[PDB]
Design a binder for these strands. Sequence first.
DNA 1: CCCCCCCCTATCGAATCCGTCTAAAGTTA
Length: 239
Amino acid sequence: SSLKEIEPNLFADEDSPVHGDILEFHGPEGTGKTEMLYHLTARCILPKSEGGLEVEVLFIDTDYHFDMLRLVTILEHRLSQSSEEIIKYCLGRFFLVYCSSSTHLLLTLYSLESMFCSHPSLCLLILDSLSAFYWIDRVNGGESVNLQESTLRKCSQCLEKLVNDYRLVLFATTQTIMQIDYRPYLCKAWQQLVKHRMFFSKQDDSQSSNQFSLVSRCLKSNSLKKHFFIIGESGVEFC
DNA sequence: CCCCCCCCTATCGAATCCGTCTAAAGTTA
Ligand SMILES: Nc1ncnc2c1ncn2[C@@H]1O[C@H](COP(=O)(O)OP(=O)(O)OP(=O)(O)O)[C@@H](O)[C@H]1O
Ligand SMILES: [Mg+2]
């Protein structure tokens, strides 16, 4: 479970067997966060023979924007030899969970622990749009700051406990609402829990309609990394 | 920190010539 093999391109020099890492994605609409997650799942789900890793992955769906036809098309167009049996065998490992509210999210977080401890093979976790319910619970609590964000703080505590308990690697998805620009609006604790930021940007022109820019910083070094990549029907490819 | 629009005005400035018609009246050995 070394970070050099996971993504040597985005992660320049952070290679070590990870005891736990938190990654989050930030970007406006239609930039490619979901496509990047699809590429990561494709590279993490295939058999070891076809450049895969053969390790478990769990996907929490909150935006309700997960598309399975796109995922199966990406997996079919990624590998070399394609068949129904092998694709079924590969997709027998993907895990998907649905949520509807912050309280329901916390209940699902707590409930997952049974299967989670029953499976030591689980090593990678995916969460998307943890700020989907930001406005709802910000308005429910009124002016009382403590009244709002409280369930989100409890959820962050539970996630941190799990990830530092059973050595997970986590990728998160955020949203751009207000205003290298960045204006945080979540709880302070989860802001501290982050390790790197993946700022997502998109170029307007049709020539660069497939090329996008990524900026990453390290909390302990404040070093900037730039990356250009091209999207495709077969998945995501780099420059 | 959040999300959407407004409106007409005012006159100026002169040029360029053509084309002819109609005859009448005798005088002094
Ligand atoms: N087959 C394809 N070939 C090339 N580009 C594609 C293909 N399918 C989708 N795309 C591109 O992928 C881009 C990313 O779309 P997507 O909805 O996954 O973005 P996202 O930023 O992850 O999502 P969101 O806007 O919901 O935050 C789209 O702008 C689209 O142009
Ligand atoms: Mg998306």
